[PDB]
Amino acid sequence: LLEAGVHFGHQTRRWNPKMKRYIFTERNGIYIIDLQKTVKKVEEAYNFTKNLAAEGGKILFVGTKKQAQDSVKEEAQRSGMYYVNQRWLGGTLTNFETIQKRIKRLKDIEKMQENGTFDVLPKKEVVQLKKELERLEKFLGGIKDMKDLPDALFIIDPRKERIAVAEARKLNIPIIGIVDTNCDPDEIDVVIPANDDAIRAVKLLTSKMADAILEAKQ
RNA sequence: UGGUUGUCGUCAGCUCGUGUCGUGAGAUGUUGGGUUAAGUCCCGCAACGAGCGCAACCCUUGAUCUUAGUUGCCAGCAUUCA
Protein backbone atom coordinates (compact mmCIF):
# COMPACT_ATOMS: atom_id res chain seq x y z
CA LEU A 1 0.00 0.00 0.00
CA LEU A 2 2.78 2.49 0.95
CA GLU A 3 4.75 0.57 -1.72
CA ALA A 4 2.83 1.89 -4.77
CA GLY A 5 1.70 5.36 -3.58
CA VAL A 6 -1.85 4.31 -2.67
CA HIS A 7 -1.79 6.64 0.38
CA PHE A 8 -1.11 9.69 -1.90
CA GLY A 9 -4.60 11.14 -2.61
CA HIS A 10 -5.52 14.10 -4.87
CA GLN A 11 -5.19 17.92 -4.38
CA THR A 12 -6.74 19.57 -1.30
CA ARG A 13 -8.63 22.23 -3.32
CA ARG A 14 -10.62 19.71 -5.43
CA TRP A 15 -11.82 17.20 -2.81
CA ASN A 16 -15.00 15.56 -1.55
CA PRO A 17 -15.51 16.43 2.17
CA LYS A 18 -17.43 13.16 2.57
CA MET A 19 -13.94 11.54 2.32
CA LYS A 20 -12.08 12.79 5.43
CA ARG A 21 -13.06 9.60 7.37
CA TYR A 22 -10.51 7.91 5.04
CA ILE A 23 -8.03 10.88 4.94
CA PHE A 24 -5.00 11.17 7.28
CA THR A 25 -3.26 14.59 7.05
CA GLU A 26 -2.11 16.58 3.96
CA ARG A 27 1.30 17.42 2.38
CA ASN A 28 2.16 19.89 -0.46
CA GLY A 29 -1.45 20.80 -1.29
CA ILE A 30 -2.34 17.07 -1.56
CA TYR A 31 -4.31 14.91 0.90
CA ILE A 32 -2.89 11.52 2.01
CA ILE A 33 -5.14 8.48 2.66
CA ASP A 34 -4.84 6.58 6.01
CA LEU A 35 -3.76 3.10 4.88
CA GLN A 36 -4.99 1.62 8.18
CA LYS A 37 -8.55 1.95 6.77
CA THR A 38 -7.51 0.63 3.30
CA VAL A 39 -6.04 -2.42 5.10
CA LYS A 40 -9.50 -2.97 6.72
CA LYS A 41 -11.32 -2.00 3.47
CA VAL A 42 -9.38 -4.17 0.99
CA GLU A 43 -10.09 -6.80 3.65
CA GLU A 44 -13.91 -6.41 3.46
CA ALA A 45 -13.78 -6.21 -0.36
CA TYR A 46 -11.65 -9.39 -0.74
CA ASN A 47 -14.28 -11.08 1.45
CA PHE A 48 -17.20 -9.42 -0.41
CA THR A 49 -15.82 -10.57 -3.78
CA LYS A 50 -15.21 -14.16 -2.62
CA ASN A 51 -18.65 -14.31 -0.96
CA LEU A 52 -20.02 -13.18 -4.39
CA ALA A 53 -17.78 -15.44 -6.55
CA ALA A 54 -18.80 -18.69 -4.77
CA GLU A 55 -22.52 -17.76 -5.11
CA GLY A 56 -21.84 -17.97 -8.88
CA GLY A 57 -21.46 -14.22 -9.49
CA LYS A 58 -19.96 -12.30 -12.40
CA ILE A 59 -17.92 -9.12 -11.87
CA LEU A 60 -17.44 -6.41 -14.49
CA PHE A 61 -14.16 -4.41 -14.19
CA VAL A 62 -14.79 -0.92 -15.52
CA GLY A 63 -11.63 1.13 -15.89
CA THR A 64 -11.39 3.29 -19.00
CA LYS A 65 -8.96 5.80 -17.41
CA LYS A 66 -5.48 5.68 -19.02
CA GLN A 67 -3.90 4.49 -15.75
CA ALA A 68 -6.27 1.45 -15.44
CA GLN A 69 -6.86 0.12 -19.01
CA ASP A 70 -4.29 -2.69 -18.94
CA SER A 71 -4.90 -3.70 -15.29
CA VAL A 72 -8.68 -4.01 -15.86
CA LYS A 73 -8.17 -6.17 -18.98
CA GLU A 74 -5.34 -8.38 -17.65
CA GLU A 75 -6.83 -8.78 -14.16
CA ALA A 76 -10.37 -9.55 -15.47
CA GLN A 77 -8.97 -12.12 -17.96
CA ARG A 78 -6.82 -13.69 -15.22
CA SER A 79 -9.99 -14.16 -13.12
CA GLY A 80 -12.13 -15.22 -16.15
CA MET A 81 -14.35 -12.15 -15.68
CA TYR A 82 -15.59 -9.31 -17.95
CA TYR A 83 -14.28 -5.77 -18.52
CA VAL A 84 -14.57 -2.37 -20.19
CA ASN A 85 -11.33 -0.49 -20.83
CA GLN A 86 -12.17 1.65 -23.88
CA ARG A 87 -15.54 3.30 -23.44
CA TRP A 88 -18.49 2.33 -21.26
CA LEU A 89 -21.42 2.22 -23.71
CA GLY A 90 -24.46 4.15 -22.37
CA GLY A 91 -26.82 1.29 -21.73
CA THR A 92 -24.31 -1.53 -21.26
CA LEU A 93 -26.61 -2.86 -18.45
CA THR A 94 -29.80 -0.75 -18.55
CA ASN A 95 -30.08 -1.37 -22.30
CA PHE A 96 -28.37 -4.80 -22.05
CA GLU A 97 -30.76 -6.45 -24.56
CA THR A 98 -29.64 -3.97 -27.23
CA ILE A 99 -25.96 -4.51 -26.28
CA GLN A 100 -26.86 -8.23 -26.53
CA LYS A 101 -27.60 -7.60 -30.25
CA ARG A 102 -24.00 -6.45 -30.77
CA ILE A 103 -22.57 -9.19 -28.53
CA LYS A 104 -24.29 -11.32 -31.19
CA ARG A 105 -23.52 -9.48 -34.49
CA LEU A 106 -19.79 -9.48 -33.52
CA LYS A 107 -19.70 -13.24 -32.90
CA ASP A 108 -21.63 -13.72 -36.20
CA ILE A 109 -19.18 -11.52 -38.21
CA GLU A 110 -16.48 -13.68 -36.51
CA LYS A 111 -18.32 -16.83 -37.72
CA MET A 112 -18.41 -15.40 -41.30
CA GLN A 113 -14.57 -15.23 -41.09
CA GLU A 114 -14.48 -18.90 -39.88
CA ASN A 115 -17.09 -20.83 -42.01
CA GLY A 116 -15.92 -18.98 -45.15
CA THR A 117 -18.30 -16.22 -46.31
CA PHE A 118 -15.46 -13.63 -46.74
CA ASP A 119 -14.41 -15.03 -50.16
CA VAL A 120 -18.03 -15.29 -51.43
CA LEU A 121 -19.32 -11.67 -51.55
CA PRO A 122 -16.10 -9.59 -51.41
CA LYS A 123 -15.31 -6.01 -52.61
CA LYS A 124 -17.11 -3.34 -50.46
CA GLU A 125 -18.96 -5.89 -48.38
CA VAL A 126 -16.08 -7.77 -46.67
CA VAL A 127 -14.04 -4.62 -45.99
CA GLN A 128 -17.26 -3.24 -44.43
CA LEU A 129 -17.78 -6.34 -42.22
CA LYS A 130 -14.15 -6.52 -41.06
CA LYS A 131 -14.14 -2.79 -40.14
CA GLU A 132 -17.40 -3.55 -38.25
CA LEU A 133 -15.89 -6.60 -36.56
CA GLU A 134 -13.13 -4.23 -35.37
CA ARG A 135 -15.49 -1.47 -34.03
CA LEU A 136 -17.14 -4.30 -32.03
CA GLU A 137 -13.69 -5.79 -31.15
CA LYS A 138 -12.74 -2.40 -29.70
CA PHE A 139 -15.85 -1.49 -27.73
CA LEU A 140 -17.59 -4.74 -26.71
CA GLY A 141 -14.29 -6.66 -26.58
CA GLY A 142 -14.47 -7.71 -22.89
CA ILE A 143 -18.22 -8.15 -22.28
CA LYS A 144 -18.03 -10.29 -25.47
CA ASP A 145 -19.02 -13.35 -23.33
CA MET A 146 -21.22 -11.62 -20.67
CA LYS A 147 -24.53 -13.55 -20.82
CA ASP A 148 -26.59 -12.27 -17.85
CA LEU A 149 -26.26 -8.96 -16.00
CA PRO A 150 -23.01 -8.59 -13.96
CA ASP A 151 -23.70 -9.16 -10.27
CA ALA A 152 -21.19 -6.57 -9.06
CA LEU A 153 -19.01 -3.87 -10.66
CA PHE A 154 -15.36 -3.07 -10.03
CA ILE A 155 -15.10 0.61 -11.03
CA ILE A 156 -11.87 2.68 -11.04
CA ASP A 157 -12.10 6.46 -10.54
CA PRO A 158 -15.92 6.50 -10.08
CA ARG A 159 -15.84 10.17 -11.20
CA LYS A 160 -14.74 9.24 -14.74
CA GLU A 161 -17.22 6.31 -14.58
CA ARG A 162 -20.22 8.47 -13.50
CA ILE A 163 -22.20 6.77 -16.31
CA ALA A 164 -21.20 3.24 -15.29
CA VAL A 165 -22.02 4.01 -11.67
CA ALA A 166 -25.51 5.32 -12.45
CA GLU A 167 -26.38 2.23 -14.53
CA ALA A 168 -25.33 -0.01 -11.63
CA ARG A 169 -27.19 2.07 -9.09
CA LYS A 170 -30.31 2.02 -11.28
CA LEU A 171 -30.34 -1.78 -11.34
CA ASN A 172 -29.42 -2.14 -7.59
CA ILE A 173 -26.19 -4.00 -8.45
CA PRO A 174 -23.32 -3.26 -5.97
CA ILE A 175 -20.15 -1.34 -6.93
CA ILE A 176 -16.73 -2.10 -5.49
CA GLY A 177 -14.93 1.11 -6.39
CA ILE A 178 -11.38 2.35 -5.94
CA VAL A 179 -12.40 5.79 -4.62
CA ASP A 180 -9.96 8.74 -4.37
CA THR A 181 -10.26 11.84 -2.13
CA ASN A 182 -12.41 13.47 -4.87
CA CYS A 183 -15.09 10.75 -4.95
CA ASP A 184 -18.57 10.54 -3.39
CA PRO A 185 -18.19 7.33 -1.29
CA ASP A 186 -21.98 6.79 -0.86
CA GLU A 187 -22.60 5.72 -4.48
CA ILE A 188 -20.00 2.95 -4.07
CA ASP A 189 -21.16 -0.03 -1.94
CA VAL A 190 -17.66 -1.37 -1.18
CA VAL A 191 -15.33 1.65 -0.92
CA ILE A 192 -11.56 1.10 -1.34
CA PRO A 193 -9.81 4.38 -0.30
CA ALA A 194 -6.81 4.65 -2.59
CA ASN A 195 -5.03 6.63 -5.29
CA ASP A 196 -6.51 5.67 -8.67
CA ASP A 197 -4.27 8.17 -10.58
CA ALA A 198 -1.11 5.97 -10.36
CA ILE A 199 -0.62 2.81 -12.47
CA ARG A 200 1.19 0.81 -9.75
CA ALA A 201 -1.60 1.71 -7.27
CA VAL A 202 -4.52 0.45 -9.41
CA LYS A 203 -2.51 -2.57 -10.60
CA LEU A 204 -2.10 -3.73 -6.98
CA LEU A 205 -5.69 -3.20 -5.84
CA THR A 206 -7.15 -4.69 -9.06
CA SER A 207 -4.98 -7.80 -8.55
CA LYS A 208 -6.51 -8.59 -5.12
CA MET A 209 -10.09 -8.65 -6.44
CA ALA A 210 -9.13 -11.11 -9.17
CA ASP A 211 -7.20 -13.05 -6.46
CA ALA A 212 -10.46 -13.54 -4.48
CA ILE A 213 -12.15 -14.85 -7.63
CA LEU A 214 -9.27 -17.31 -8.15
CA GLU A 215 -9.20 -18.20 -4.39
CA ALA A 216 -12.87 -19.36 -4.61
CA LYS A 217 -12.03 -21.08 -7.94
CA GLN A 218 -9.64 -23.18 -5.76
C1' U B 1 -68.63 17.45 -63.50
C1' G B 2 -65.51 12.80 -64.14
C1' G B 3 -61.30 12.16 -66.87
C1' U B 4 -57.05 14.45 -69.31
C1' U B 5 -54.03 18.44 -70.04
C1' G B 6 -50.95 22.51 -69.37
C1' U B 7 -48.31 24.92 -64.86
C1' C B 8 -43.81 25.76 -58.28
C1' G B 9 -41.25 18.74 -59.87
C1' U B 10 -35.42 18.16 -56.48
C1' C B 11 -34.68 21.97 -55.00
C1' A B 12 -34.25 20.90 -48.95
C1' G B 13 -33.63 15.62 -44.95
C1' C B 14 -37.27 13.51 -41.88
C1' U B 15 -38.21 9.54 -38.06
C1' C B 16 -38.40 4.86 -34.98
C1' G B 17 -37.12 0.82 -31.15
C1' U B 18 -34.80 0.28 -26.61
C1' G B 19 -32.06 3.20 -23.00
C1' U B 20 -31.17 7.63 -20.60
C1' C B 21 -32.24 12.93 -18.87
C1' G B 22 -36.66 16.20 -17.55
C1' U B 23 -42.59 17.06 -12.74
C1' G B 24 -43.75 18.24 -17.83
C1' A B 25 -44.06 20.09 -22.86
C1' G B 26 -39.60 18.12 -24.33
C1' A B 27 -34.17 16.44 -25.16
C1' U B 28 -30.59 12.96 -26.56
C1' G B 29 -29.74 9.60 -30.51
C1' U B 30 -29.76 13.47 -35.09
C1' U B 31 -25.62 19.91 -30.83
C1' G B 32 -19.40 17.75 -31.24
C1' G B 33 -14.26 17.62 -34.61
C1' G B 34 -13.07 16.71 -39.39
C1' U B 35 -14.50 15.22 -44.45
C1' U B 36 -17.77 14.67 -48.99
C1' A B 37 -20.99 16.47 -54.94
C1' A B 38 -24.09 14.88 -50.94
C1' G B 39 -29.68 14.15 -46.99
C1' U B 40 -21.44 11.69 -47.45
C1' C B 41 -18.17 8.95 -44.43
C1' C B 42 -15.00 8.50 -40.13
C1' C B 43 -14.00 9.83 -35.24
C1' G B 44 -16.17 11.22 -31.27
C1' C B 45 -20.32 11.13 -27.36
C1' A B 46 -26.03 8.72 -22.66
C1' A B 47 -26.60 6.46 -25.99
C1' C B 48 -26.87 1.70 -28.59
C1' G B 49 -29.02 0.14 -33.26
C1' A B 50 -32.47 0.79 -37.27
C1' G B 51 -36.13 2.81 -40.96
C1' C B 52 -37.77 6.17 -44.77
C1' G B 53 -36.08 9.45 -48.34
C1' C B 54 -31.44 9.61 -51.59
C1' A B 55 -29.47 5.99 -54.49
C1' A B 56 -31.02 1.42 -56.32
C1' C B 57 -34.75 -1.50 -58.37
C1' C B 58 -36.58 -1.52 -64.83
C1' C B 59 -34.56 -0.34 -70.02
C1' U B 60 -30.11 1.04 -73.17
C1' U B 61 -24.63 1.25 -74.00
C1' G B 62 -18.91 0.35 -73.15
C1' A B 63 -15.20 -4.90 -71.79
C1' U B 64 -15.38 -10.10 -71.20
C1' C B 65 -16.92 -15.18 -70.65
C1' U B 66 -20.30 -19.44 -71.16
C1' U B 67 -24.39 -21.61 -73.91
C1' A B 68 -26.42 -21.37 -79.14
C1' G B 69 -24.46 -21.67 -84.52
C1' U B 70 -28.87 -20.66 -88.67
C1' U B 71 -31.65 -18.05 -92.61
C1' G B 72 -25.89 -14.85 -89.68
C1' C B 73 -19.88 -15.58 -90.12
C1' C B 74 -15.37 -17.36 -94.17
C1' A B 75 -9.89 -16.93 -90.85
C1' G B 76 -7.71 -21.19 -92.79
C1' C B 77 -9.15 -25.23 -97.52
C1' A B 78 -12.43 -26.28 -103.06
C1' U B 79 -15.19 -22.79 -106.11
C1' U B 80 -16.07 -17.39 -107.93
C1' C B 81 -20.17 -12.83 -110.93
C1' A B 82 -20.60 -13.59 -105.92
UniProtKB/Swiss-Prot annotation:
InterPro entries: Ribosomal_uS2, Ribosomal_uS2_bac/mit/plastid, Ribosomal_uS2_CS, Ribosomal_uS2_flav_dom_sf. The keyword Ribosomal protein applies. SUPFAM superfamilies: Ribosomal protein S2. GO terms for biological process: translation. GO terms for cellular component: cytosolic small ribosomal subunit. Pfam families: Ribosomal_S2. Keywords: Ribonucleoprotein, Ribosomal protein. GO terms for molecular function: structural constituent of ribosome. Part of the 30S ribosomal subunit. Interacts with BrxC. NCBIfam families: rpsB_bact. Belongs to the universal ribosomal protein uS2 family. HAMAP family: Ribosomal_uS2_B. This is Small ribosomal subunit protein uS2.
